[PDB]
Amino acid sequence: AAQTNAPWGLARISSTSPGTSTYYYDESAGQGSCVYVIDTGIEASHPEFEGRAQMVKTYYYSSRDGNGHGTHCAGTVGSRTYGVAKKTQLFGVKVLDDNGSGQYSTIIAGMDFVASDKNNRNCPKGVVASLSLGGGYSSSVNSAAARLQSSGVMVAVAAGNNNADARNYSPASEPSVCTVGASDRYDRRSSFSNYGSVLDIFGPGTDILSTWIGGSTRSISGTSMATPHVAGLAAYLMTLGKTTAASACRYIADTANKGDLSNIPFGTVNLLAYNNYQA
Numbered sequence: 001a002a003q004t005n006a007p008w009g010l011a012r013i014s015s016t017s018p019g020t021s022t023y024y025y026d027e028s029a030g031q032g033s034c035v036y037v038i039d040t041g042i043e044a045s046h047p048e049f050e051g052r053a054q055m056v057k058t059y060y061y062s063s064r065d066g067n068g069h070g071t072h073c074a075g076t077v078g079s080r081t082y083g084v085a086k087k088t089q090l091f092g093v094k095v096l097d098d099n100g101s102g103q104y105s106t107i108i109a110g111m112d113f114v115a116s117d118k119n120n121r122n123c124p125k126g127v128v129a130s131l132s133l134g135g136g137y138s139s140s141v142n143s144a145a146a147r148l149q150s151s152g153v154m155v156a157v158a159a160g161n162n163n164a165d166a167r168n169y170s171p172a173s174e175p176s177v178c179t180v181g182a183s184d185r186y187d188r189r190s191s192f193s194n195y196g197s198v199l200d201i202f203g204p205g206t207d208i209l210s211t212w213i214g215g216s217t218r219s220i221s222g223t224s225m226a227t228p229h230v231a232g233l234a235a236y237l238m239t240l241g242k243t244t245a246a247s248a249c250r251y252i253a254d255t256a257n258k259g260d261l262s263n264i265p266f267g268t269v270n271l272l273a274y275n276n277y278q279a
């Protein structure tokens with residue numbers, strides 16, 4: 001299949017070279033898989049979600065996305081125009097408030113919810129979880145992310161926007177879960193992206209167009225935009241049978257575009273999320 005005039009990140013993930021504008025992917029589009037978006041929530045009403053998104057949990061007076069952040073991220077996982085796995089089922093777990101904030105104990109609660117809630121939901125192709133969030137080092141927070149992983153969920157988390165080492169941020173610094181760094185349309189390392197040995201893969205994350213609250217769209221930047229392409233991609237390769245939850249991140253990094261990114265410091269991996277799809 002081909003999306004003509006796709007966003008620069010969608011094209012980059014099915015492209016051996018930057019600067020193209022057609023995203024190339026198997027019709028499967030993640031049908032049969034499920035991706036939990038742990039964030040400020042989702043705007044499931046968006047035409048872009050086609051009723052494939054639904055809120056399943058919240059910790060605040062509302063489960064509405066009064067921010068846009070979570071809605072922006074879910075649009076990169078499975079929205080028809082902006083997402084990677086365009087038939088995936090999205091589940092919203094609102095752990096962040098409408099300012100994009102939330103305490104650690106709440107985030108921990110959220111991951112704990114997904115590993116159990118997957119058992120009530122129907123996902124014969126496997127489960128993914130996107131965590132475009134982070135903060136200072138926390139081992140409690142890291143164990144939470146590691147618990148989500150060994151339970152049968154493919155975790156991708158943002159490496160951080162501090163332009164520093166990701167070993168001092170959680171859950172970014174947890175070795176069992178997949179830590180996505182950010183790059184731009186010129187295959188540069190994103191200005192803001194954290195780096196470090198803990199990273200597993202880079203995904204598109206500068207000037208990322210995607211769904212927004214109010215039935216709209218907008219372009220914003222961050223490792224939070226890098227996290228959902230890998231998330232969607234994981235769910236894409238799981239539907240195909242090419243990988244499983246527990247080995248997708250190593251699968252992605254194995255089959256990724258080796259060594260095409262400028263400004264990667266020594267010690268940080270030079271791998272760019274890629275879908276090796278052959279029409």
